[PDB]
C-alpha cells in the first residue's frame, strides 16, 4: 500500500532516483552531500539507521534488519544488479558518442 496514492506523482512527493543511489553506493562523497542536504534531528532514529539502496531512514536497527528481508529491498537490489539507466546508456542506444579530441 502507498500512502496517498492520488498525489504520488507530484514533484513535492518525489523520491531519490536509482542512478543517484548507484552513485551513492560507489562514492561516499555523493552520499555525504545528499545527507548534508537533510537535518539529522528530524530523521528517524537520528539518522543512524539508513538503507542506501532504498534511500530510506529507519527508526531502529531491528527495523532496518527486518526491512532487508522484504521484497521492496530485494526489488531495489535486483534493479541495482540490472543497472540504472543513465545518459551514457541513452547515448549508446542511438549510437551517438562524445568527441573530445
DSSP state of 85: -
The footprint of another protein (CB under 8 A) covers: 9, 14-15, 17-18, 20, 79, 82, 85, 87, 89-90, 92-101
Q: From residue 2, how far is each of 5, 13, 63, 71 by CA, in Å?
A: 6, 12, 19, 15
42 assigned to a ligand binding site: no
21 interface partner picked from Zn ion, another protein, none, CB below 5 to 8 A per type: none
Contact call for residue 18 and Zn ion (CB under 5 A): no
Measured CA to CA, the distance from residue 67 to residue 4 in angstroms comes to: 21
73 interface partner picked from another protein, Zn ion, none, CB below 5 to 8 A per type: Zn ion
Measured CA to CA, the distance from residue 93 to residue 50 in angstroms comes to: 34
Per the annotation, binding residues for Zn(2+) are 51, 54, 67, 73
Amino acid at each position: 500500500g502507498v500512502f496517498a496514492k492520488r498525489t504520488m506523482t507530484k514533484t513535492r512527493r518525489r523520491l531519490r532516483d536509482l542512478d543517484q543511489i548507484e552513485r551513492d553506493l560507489r562514492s561516499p562523497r555523493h552520499l555525504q552531500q545528499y545527507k548534508e542536504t537533510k537535518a539529522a534531528e528530524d530523521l528517524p532514529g537520528l539518522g543512524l539507521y539508513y538503507c542506501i539502496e532504498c534511500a530510506k531512514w529507519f527508526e531502529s536497527e531491528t527495523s532496518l534488519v527486518g526491512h532487508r528481508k522484504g521484497k521492496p529491498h530485494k526489488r531495489r537490489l535486483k534493479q541495482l544488479k540490472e543497472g540504472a539507466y543513465t545518459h551514457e546508456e541513452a547515448m549508446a542506444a542511438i549510437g551517438y558518442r562524445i568527441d573530445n579530441g
